[model samples]
Target chain A: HTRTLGFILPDLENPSYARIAKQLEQGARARGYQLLIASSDDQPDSERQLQQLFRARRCDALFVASCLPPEDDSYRELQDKGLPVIAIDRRLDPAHFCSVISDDRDASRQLAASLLSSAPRSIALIGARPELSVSQARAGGFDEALQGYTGEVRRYQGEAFSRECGQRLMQQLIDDLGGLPDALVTTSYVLLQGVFDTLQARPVDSRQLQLGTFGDNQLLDFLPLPVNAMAQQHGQIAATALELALAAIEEKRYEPGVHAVGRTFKQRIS
Target chain B: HTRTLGFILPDLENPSYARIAKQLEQGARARGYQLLIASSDDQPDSERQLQQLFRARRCDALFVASCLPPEDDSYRELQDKGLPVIAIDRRLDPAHFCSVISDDRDASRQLAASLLSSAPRSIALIGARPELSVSQARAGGFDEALQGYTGEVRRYQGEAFSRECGQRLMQQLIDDLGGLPDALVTTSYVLLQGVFDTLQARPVDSRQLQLGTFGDNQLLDFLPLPVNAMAQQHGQIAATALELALAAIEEKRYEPGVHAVGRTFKQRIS
Candidate 1:
C-alpha cells in the first residue's frame, strides 16, 4: 500500500486554506506519497474525528490546521502517542510539535500602519473572535500600531470569521457610528465579505474611505479604489510545513517550535 | 487497509465547487471511507494524471469533474478498466456512466426571465468557453428567454470560467459598447467575480442596471441592489452522488444515465 499523508484543514470554503491544502497535496506527491484531505468545519469534534482516523493508521503522517486552541492539552496527547503531527496555519504551540504559521502580530501591526497612512481621520477595525490567537494577535497589533496616532480607532469583534458575523458586526457599526468610518480594516476574507455586504446594502458615501483586509482575493485586484491589505504567503508556509513533515518522517524526530512564514502587505494603486 | 474514495475537482478557489468537495468528504467519512481530493486546475493533462493515480489501486471508487469534453475516448478507456466511476457537476454524457448535474438550462431561463422583468432596455451575457455544455445551456436558455423581447442582447464568451477571463471580457464589453449594459448575466461565480471586480473599479451607476448570475455568493446578498441568481443545490447533489457511488459499490452493477438536480433562483430582497 502507498503511504498517505493526511491533512485536516479548518474549511475549504476559505480559499486561503484551500491553497494550503493543494500545495501540501503537490508536495506529498513529489515525495512519492499520496495525500488524504478532510475539512474539520472548524468544529472540535470534527477535528478530533479526523485526528483519530490518522492515528488509526489511515495515514503515515498528519498535518493539521485544527479548531482547537494552542493551549489545548490534546496537542500533547497526539504528540505523546508517537504520531508525526505538524501544525499548519494554526499554531498549536508546544515544545514537542513543529508549527507552520504566519507572524500575524507583526504583520497586522504593519498592515494597520500602512492602511492608516492613507490619512483617514478615524478608522474601524473588524476582527474575529478574541479567543483565537490569530485574532488576538491581529487586533492587538493593530491597536498597538495606532498607539501614537492622533486619529480614532474603533474596534468591533465578531463571534467568528464568517460572512454573517462580519455582516452583523459591520451593520452594528453602521447603526452605532451612523456611517462608514474614514477607513476600514477587516481581519479575514470571510469577515470582509460581510463588511462589504453591509456597506453595499447601506450605500455609504465611501468614496473617501480607505479599505484594507487581511487575506488576498483576486476580486481585490481590480477594485475601483486602492485597498491596502495583508496577504498570506501560503507557498512559503506550505513548503516549510512539508519540509518539516518529511524531515520528521525520515529522521523519526521533529524539531519542536514555531516556524514562521512571512506575510506580505500590498498598497494598491488607483 | 481503509477504503478510499478519490475525487478530482476543477478548482478549490471556487466556493461553490469547494462546498461540493466538503460535502463529499463528510458523506464518505460517514460510510467508513476516506476521501482523497485533487484539483485538475481545469487542464486535461492534470485530469489524466489524477485518473491514473486512482486507477493504480490507490482508491476503491472515483468521482471526477473532468476538463475533457464528453466525446473524448478517455472516459470509455477508464470505464473499460472495471473501476466504479461517477461524474459530478460536469456531465460526462452518452450514459456510459452515471452522472450528477444541475439543471442549468431551465434554471438559467427562469433566472433570465426574472431578471428581465426589471425592464432593462438591453442585456449583456457573459459566459465561459462556449464549447462547454453548461455555458452553452446557460447562454442558450437565456437567449430563448429573451426571444420575445425587443431589447438587444450582447453576448461575450470567455476562454474559461475564471476571474481574469471574466474581467478581460467585461473590460472588452465596456470598451466596445461604450458603457455597461442595462442588464448583465454572468454564467459562473468565478466569472461573476471578474464582473464585480471590473464594475467595482469602474464605479457603474448599477442603481438602474439589473444584475443576474448563475452561481450564488454571499457577497451577492449585500450588493447595493438585489441580484437575481440561480443557486445550485450543492448539498442535495453531493448526497445523491455519494448515495449512487455507495449503491454501485454494493450491488456490483453500475447505473448509466444523467441524474439532474433542480436549481433554485432567488431574487434578493433589499
Candidate 2:
C-alpha cells in the first residue's frame, strides 16, 4: 500500500489554513505520498471524531493544525501508539508532538511596536480566546511591547478567531468608550474583519484611528482606513511540515520538536 | 485608495475555492491591488447582499463563482451599471459576464470513459442539483459517454453538492439495490467522501467496486478502494481569471465570453 499522511486543519474557511492545505496536498503528491485531509471546523467534538476517523483508516502519520489545547488527551494516546504525529500552526507542549508554525509572538510584537510608534492617546486590542496558545502569545507580546507607554490600554477577547467575534467585541468596546479607539491591534485577520464590520455601520473617521493587525487580508490595502499586518509564510511552513512528515514516515519514528517560519510585516499606511 | 477586486465564492469550507481565493489574493497583491473576499454559502440572498456590499464599497472589479443561475437578473444589473464583473468556475449566460472555468463537461466525460473502460456490469452516477450548469454538464457528459455500452446505468441526483446529500443519496441507492453497484462515479470530491462515509458503516468489498470521481481529494491515492478523478487546475484558473479581471478594470471594457482551463485526470487503479 502507498504511504498516507493525515492532515487536520482548524478551519478551511480561513484562507491562511486553506493555503497551507493546498500546499501540503501539492507537496505530498510531488513526493509520491497521499494525504487524508480533514477540517475540524474549530469544534472539539468534530476534531475528535476526525481524529478517530483518521486512526481507523490506518494513516501512517498524522499532522494537525488543531483548535484544541496542547494538553488534549488524544495527542498522548496517539503518541502512545507510536504514531508519527506532528502539529501545524498550533504548538504542542510537554513535547508530545513536533510542530511547525509562524512565529506568532514575534510577529504580534512587531505589529504592537508599530502601533506604539504612532503614539496614540489610547489603544484597543482585539484577540482570539485567551485559551489558545497563539492568542496568549500574541496578547502577551503586544502587552509586553506596550509597557511603559503612558496611555490607556483596553483589551477585548473573543471566544473564537472569527469575524462575528471580532465584530461583537469591537462593538462592545465602542459602546464603552463612546467612540473608536485612537489605535487598534487585532491578533487575527478574522478579528480585524469583525472590527471593520462594526466600524462600517457606525462610520468612524479613518484618518484618526491607527490600525495594526496580526494576520494579512488583501482588503486591508484598499480600505479607506489603512491597516498594517503581518503575513505568515504559508508556503514555507507547508513545505517544512511535509519534509518533517516524510522524514518521520521513512524512519518509522519521530522526535518531538518545534520549527517556526519567519513572518513578514506589510505597512500600507504612512 | 488602492484598486480592489471583489471575489465571491460559493463555499469556503471547500478547499477548492479557498485555493482560488489565496491565489487571487496573491496575484492581486503583486499587481498593487487588494481583494475583498466573501462567501455566499450557496445562498442566493447572501450572494445578492454580498454583491451589494461590493458595490457599496466601490470595488473596481468583481469576480464571482456564483450560486445563482447563469441568467440571474442581479448579474445583469451589475453589467448595466458598467461594473467589470467576471464569473469564476461557473459560466454565465452570453452577454451577462465573462467567465473562467476548468472545462467540467469534458473532464466528466473523461472520468466516465475511464470507468466504462473497466468493463463493469453496472454503473451508478451521483451528482449535485440538476439545475446547476456544472452538475447538468457533468451528468450529461457521463450519460453521453455511457451510451451504447449495453450496461446497467443507475443515477442518483442530490439537492446540494454537500457531504450529507451525497451520503444520503448513496445510502438510498444502496438500500434499493440490496448491495453496492459494480462501479460508481461521484461528480464532486465532497460527494465522493459522502459515498465513502456511507460505505464505511456497512463495509463493502473494495476490490469488487470500481470508482471514479470529479474533483481531486488528497486521500484518493491512498484509499483501499482506489479512484480515478479529474483534478481542476485551480491556480491556472485563478491566475487567468485575475488577468481577465485586471484587463477589464484597466481597459474600462469587458466582452462577455468564457475561458476554459483543461482538467487533469489521475488514475490510481485499472
Candidate 3:
C-alpha cells in the first residue's frame, strides 16, 4: 500500500467541509496513513480529472464529495478494479459504493417544526437545485412540517446553491409579500448568506426575521440575533467515512451501500 | 519540477487558513500545478515530519504557516539546498525565506480606532499565544490605536489560540470587570468564538457592547451588529506567493526577504 489516501470535495470555502477534511485527515494520520486532498471546484470536469490524477498517484483509496451526476458509474468502475472509492457528504450511485451522508430530511423536519412553533404570521423556505436529492429532502421535511399550519408559506428554490441565488429570491420575496416574512429558513449555508445580504441592505425594523439555516458555523453564534441552525455532525460523518474506507482497504474489496448519521438539532424558540 | 506544491499549517479548524489554502490551490491550478495540503496541529514534530515527508514526495515547492519557532533555520537550510519555501500568514526569520504576511498591525489599528471612536468608557482585548509575532503585532495595533484614548483597556493574551483558552479568558474577564466591557476585540477567529460562547451563556443586555475581530468572513456581514473586520488579502497574498514560487522554480535559486501587503480595513462607525 502507498500509505496515502486521496480525497476530493467541493472547494474549502465552506467551513463545514474544511472541518470535515480536517477530521478525516486527523483520523487517517492516527491510523498510520496520510491523506492527499484536493478541491474539485464543484465542477464535473475537475472532479473527473482529479479522480484520474489520484488513480495515477496510486492512492490506497479515494473518498470524494463528487459533483458528478448521481447516476454516474465512474466511481463504481474504479471500485471494481480494486480501488476503494467511498462517497461522503454527497451520495453517488448508492448501489455501487458505500456512501456516507447526514440525515438532512430528519434534521430539517425538527428544525422546521421548531420554527413553526413560534407562531409566525408568515413563513418562507429558500433552497437551491430543487431537483437534487439533498435539496428535495430538506424541502420535503419542511413541507411535511407545514401540513397543518394555517399561516402563509412561501417557497423558493433556485438553480444554484449560492449566496447570489439566495439574494435574488429574497429580493423577489420582499416585493411579492410587500413585507418581510416573520420566519425564514434556508437549506444551505451559502443560501443563508445571500438572504442575509438582502436583509442587511434594508433598515433594521423592516426585516426583523426569525432566521434559521442549515449548517452550523462559529460566526453564527456571534450574531446580534439568535439564529436556529442545523448542525451536520462532521465528527460523526468523518469517523464513519474513514471507517468504511479503512475496512475496504483491509479487505481489498469494495462495499456498496449508504450510511446515514443522525444530525444535531439546535433551535431558538424566540 | 514535480508540479505539486505542499502546504502545512497549524490546522484547518480556522476558516481563515482554510480560505487561504483554497486561494493558493486555485492559483496553483491556474498555472498548471497542484497543491498537496496537510495540517500540522501546531506541533513542532509534526511540522518537521511533514517537511521531510513532502521532501521525500519530491514536491516542487512548499508553502507553510509554520508552527515552529520563527528563528528556526530548518526551512532556511531546506532553501539553501534546492527547495523553494515560501511562508505565508506566519513569518520566519526575515533574512532566510520569502514570507508573505498580512498587514495585521495596521488593520487592527484601524479596527481598534473605530471601536474606540464609539465612545465606549472601557474596552477589552483578547488573544492567544502572547509570545508569537502575529499576536504581538495585532496587540501592538490595538495599543497604537489606544494611545490617546482615556478609556480603560483590559488586555488578555493566553497560552494557546484555541477556543478553550478564549472561553477561559472571557469568563475571567467578565468576573474581573464585574460586567462586560463597553467594547471588545479578539485577535483570532477561534478566540472570537470563545468570547461569544461566554456571552451567549449569560443574559443578553449585560453583554451588549461594541465588538470587533481580526478576520472578515461572510457570516459577519449577516450579523445584526455591524462588526469591524480586518479583511486579509488572501487573493493578493496567494497571487504573490505563487509568483515567488514560480519565479524560484524557473530560476533554480532562492531569494530571501519579507513582502508586506497592505491591509483592508472595514470598520463600522456604529
Per-candidate DockQ values are: 0.35, 0.05, 0.61
Give per-residue CA lDDT, model 1, range B110-184, as digits (tens).
878887887787888899879877777898888889988888778999788888999999898877667788888
Which residue pairs in candidate 3 have backbone atoms (N, alpha carbon, C) closer than 3 angstroms, thus clashing? Answer: none
Residue B35 local lDDT, model 1: 75
Off by over 4 Å in 3: A113-124, A143-155, A175-183, A209-211, A218-227, A251-254, B109-123, B143-154, B218-226
What DockQ does predicted model 2 obtain? 0.05
Candidate topping TM-score: 3
Docking quality of model 2: it rates as incorrect
Best candidate, DockQ: 3
- Highest lDDT: which candidate? 3
What is every candidate's alpha-carbon RMSD to the true fold?
5.2, 23.7, 3.0
Estimate, for each residue in A1-270, the C-alpha lDDT of model 3 and write its tens digit: 788888897867777788888899899989977877788877777778788777767788998987777767777677766788888888777667789998888877877888877778999999877766787789999889887889989999987777799999999889889989988889987788888789889997666778888986676666666779988889999999999999888866556888998877676546
Residues A1-270, model 1: lDDT tens digits: 236687888777788988888788777767876676777778777677767766764456789887786667775766677667888877876567789999988888887887776787888899877787778888888888898888777899877678898999988877777777887888888888787777677544553467878887665654455677788898889899988888887887788889887788877833
Predicted candidate 3 versus true structure: per-residue lDDT over B208-229, tens digit per residue: 7898888766766665556777
Residue A179, candidate 1: Cα error in Å is 12
Quote the chain B TM-score of every prediction.
0.95, 0.95, 0.94
Q: How many backbone clashes does candidate 3 have?
A: 0
The CAPRI quality class of candidate 3 comes to medium
lDDT tens digits by residue: candidate 2, B1-270: 237677888765576887787688668767967565566667777677668766755678888988787566887877677678889987888565789987888888888888878778888899877788888888888888887888778889888887788889889878877888888999888788788778777734433488888887545533556789888898899899998888887877677888999888998776
